[PDB]
Design a protein around this ligand. Sequence first.
Ligand code: HEM
Length: 392
Amino acid sequence: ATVLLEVPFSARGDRIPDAVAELRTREPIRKVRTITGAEAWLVSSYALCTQVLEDRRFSMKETAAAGAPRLNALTVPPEVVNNMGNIADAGLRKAVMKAITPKALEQFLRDTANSLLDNLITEGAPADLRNDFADPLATALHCKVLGIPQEDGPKLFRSLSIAFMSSADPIPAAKINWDRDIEYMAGILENPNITTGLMGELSRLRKDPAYSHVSDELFATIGVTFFGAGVISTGSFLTTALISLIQRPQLRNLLHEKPELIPAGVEELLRINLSFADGLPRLATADIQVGDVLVRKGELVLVLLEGANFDPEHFPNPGSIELDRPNPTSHLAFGRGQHFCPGSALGRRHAQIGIEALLKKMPGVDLAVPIDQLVWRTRFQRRIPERLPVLW
Ligand code: HEM
């Protein structure tokens, strides 16, 4: 006798488990047990993953309902799961988008990357590319985008190792750090020195008559959530993309020699990325046929991003980085449908400029320890190594 198949399969972000291609072939939608003990449907083909993400009857907001089967415990108030919907309803969507584009900024990214790298070179090998390069780069970018002081970035950043946990039970430290971070953002909206970036724009709109009935809670929430999601997602993706690049010295050499090819290489590094640790969660609001399974109202569905993005029926020779594919941006790294990532262009540009600056300064970058010695963070919403030691 064996127990029901458990998720997630492995916290390692340097290799995809053989089980993924086995499931996809034999049972592309199948029952599994989450860390809470709840049952869920795990979806692993490109076709079925797209079907779920494009049908709003599979609901993000209803995952917060009391009594529902859960992937993991909430780390935010339940109304905050419907964050984008709340922004839209307030008439703030277009203003938020415009403030988080990369086209405002790029020269600030380049100068910041180059300064971080020069400091590593001065100190001498080994260097830690996560704690002393990718995560500070992400932190600095989001303080500039929000319009807040660079010197505030480190304390906001320290909440994230707990805020983005994937836990079976509620986490007391997440509420302590949330309430404090909300009080900070509320203080920013009342600070007359803050007149640029996303928080500068929200601070103006707050006093305009067309927004007089929008709550002060929502304005502070937008600042905490966009800082947190953008900094964890960009820092974690750049770190694990740098591992994928270092393990491919022929590609590293080619991008060094021809940096025009960096945007096509970053699109492939997004396609093969293992940064999301769990499937994307949805709750069925109706009975809906998905492949051979009739999913019932009230059941939990998990959309496995690497199931879609390594599917050979959609991307032939899926484990290989190919810079001349006919369908290069059709991957699901930023999601699909109603909830498609609002920061996609800013995330692409963070990774392009970081990689471009690294290869120019350190063309002989390599790991300084055997790859099996990297320590993979567990029970977390991302897969990341705790330290990334390199030489050059
Ligand atoms: C390479 C970097 C990034 C990746 C891989 C990424 C990935 C994703 C994914 C897969 C989703 C969909 C979640 C779902 O449907 O359940 C998403 C949504 C979201 N992302 Fe990103 N993201 C990145 C960068 C950013 C940045 C830079 C920001 C903001 C500054 C951001 C803010 C958000 C927000 C607020 C949502 C929720 C949208 C909603 O609920 O409608 N992300 N991201």
